[PDB]
Nucleic acid binder design. Sequence first.
DNA 1: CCGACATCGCATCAGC
DNA 2: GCTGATGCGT
DNA 3: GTCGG
Length: 327
Amino acid sequence: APQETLNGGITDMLTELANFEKNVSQAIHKYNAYRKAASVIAKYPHKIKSGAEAKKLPGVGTKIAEKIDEFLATGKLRKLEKIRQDDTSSSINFLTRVSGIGPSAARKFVDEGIKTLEDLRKNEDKLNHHQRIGLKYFGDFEKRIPREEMLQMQDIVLNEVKKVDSEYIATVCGSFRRGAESSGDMDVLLTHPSFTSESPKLLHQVVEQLQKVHFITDTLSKGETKFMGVCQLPSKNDEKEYPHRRIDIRLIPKDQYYCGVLYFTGSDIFNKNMRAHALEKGFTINEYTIRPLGVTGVAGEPLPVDSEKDIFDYIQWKYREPKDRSE
DNA sequence: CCGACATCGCATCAGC
DNA sequence: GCTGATGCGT
DNA sequence: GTCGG
Ligand code: NA
Ligand code: NA
Ligand code: NA
Ligand code: NA
Ligand code: NA
Ligand code: NA
């Protein structure tokens, strides 16, 4: 992990441009183009001396190379400086930090004069359920979660799930499963022997129980297979109350469980790489299954998977411990 | 030059 | 009432 | 915005 002081000015620049493309210009692909350029440069173990040097990295093109040259020569970007001072654009960009408020809602709000969290408060009836919760926990949702709190959160989830039905299988994935010292949220993958690709209250009972012991505090969305909400650890005697945290609970069919555990454990860089390796081996891996590719390139039928190991075996790859899946 | 860039559950809008 | 499209986070 | 058919 190269020092950020190496090319941090550049990575921050690209990241900022990324947000404006996504939130203001509504160009998701340019958003990702910038992110990809920011990521490949954040990994470059050398201080970039010119745009041409960066141009050699995959993801960096002529336009970004030109912007780097300007930033290296002036310590800033004219277009960025200008958009930063634009009241409309800066307001739209900012509002998207509220969970539930995307580019469209942000633009809609700003057009009608609603530009700050204060404006949002005075106009609660103009917000949907999700957005109201995002506003209520604006601060908490941007805070990170120390691993110690994740362990405590896991303790509660695993205990309550087993209490509902000892046959449930629950796995907390995400970077937490890879040993991360902090997490941005909690992702729980749930399954049950009675639930398979071929045969609906399993998820509900679990959410209900977590609400019963006051762990889950709010609901953003809830269907038969996916729950997205808010949780909070119990407060310690006469001590500071814990921040509210984002938690997702997915119910997955037994036969697709381990592909799910693999996919949601990542990391993204690892998933991308494992998918790559899978392909050159005649296999395609998504969050649901692993399928063999046949001559023409069409994916056949899902292969039986009884664990993460099975997936690794198919692609003739040694099982990799989650801690070693940073890439 | 120009199409791909991930997919899809859930909440809610658009429209019959 | 419904189906399908869109927004959002994923 | 970048890559690549
Ligand atoms: Na390049
Ligand atoms: Na948002
Ligand atoms: Na956001
Ligand atoms: Na039991
Ligand atoms: Na999906
Ligand atoms: Na329709």
